[PDB]
Amino acid sequence: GMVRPPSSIQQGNGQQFQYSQMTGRRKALLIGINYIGSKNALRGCINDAHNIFNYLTTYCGYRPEDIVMLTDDQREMVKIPLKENIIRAMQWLVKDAQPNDALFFHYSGHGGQTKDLDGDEEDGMDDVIYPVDFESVGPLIDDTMHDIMVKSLPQGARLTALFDSCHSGTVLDLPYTYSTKGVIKEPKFSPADVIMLSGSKADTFADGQNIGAMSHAFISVMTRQPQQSYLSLLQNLRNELAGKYSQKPQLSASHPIDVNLQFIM
Ligand SMILES: [Mg+2]
Ligand SMILES: [Mg+2]
Ligand SMILES: [Mg+2]
């Protein structure tokens, strides 16, 4: 059998944190932006969000009324991934979060860094996503995403964030990153259970071909073999991406992870 994550509060590296048991509420926010008709148009991001929608509702018990999907092919304004709609949807996603909830966030679109002009550090950069209206309202930055989606969460609430944009863990101010090689990044800590999956690589605008590889690989890995440890998830993602893309899978987290534990969805 598998080893499920422990249910007691954990101490690790001067941090208290709790793994989600994934027995709580299942809500998801899925964002696919093709920037349709613009010079930064992409072709597959909306499809990426639909593919994650189908995976979550078919295999993970998510109900359609519990998923907000924002894609820019929509004629209804409230379904468009405008910055203000993304912010309101991120607030919806975490409202009411409890320990053991299973919240899901997916972003497929452009990503990069912008100068952190108020940041009390020269050459300091914000890590950002690009809402469809970014040419008129700017990006949505790490600080905001972290403040809405992470800082709010109770101990033991899961947020599983899947980025198709090749962000690093800095996009959600996560202190830990794991690869198939082990710990590749480690240290205001959260006790929640925030994990992030993303590929290693204003940096997507000329490299749009690596966008979308992670959700495709994730769905493929999890469909072929639903039983995964965090270790095998990263190995199987690595195997799924190795030829077709240069990006490598990276698991970022708000807390240390014993990779031998089961990765529960
Ligand atoms: Mg700033
Ligand atoms: Mg930052
Ligand atoms: Mg694609």
Author numbering: 73 to 259, 310 to 323, 329 to 392
Quote the study that presented this structure, word for word.
Metacaspases are caspase-like homologs which undergo a complex maturation process involving multiple intra-chain cleavages resulting in a composite enzyme made of a p10 and a p20 domain. Their proteolytic activity involving a cysteine-histidine catalytic dyad, show peptide bond cleavage specificity in the C-terminal to lysine and arginine, with both maturation- and catalytic processes being calcium-dependent. Here, we present the structure of a metacaspase from the yeast Candida glabrata, CgMCA-I, in complex with a unique calcium along with a structure in which three magnesium ions are bound. The monomers CgMCA-ICa and CgMCA-IMg both contain a p20 and a p10 domain forming a caspase-like core in which a two-stranded anti-parallel β-sheet from the p10 domain completes a six stranded parallel β-sheet in the p20 domain.
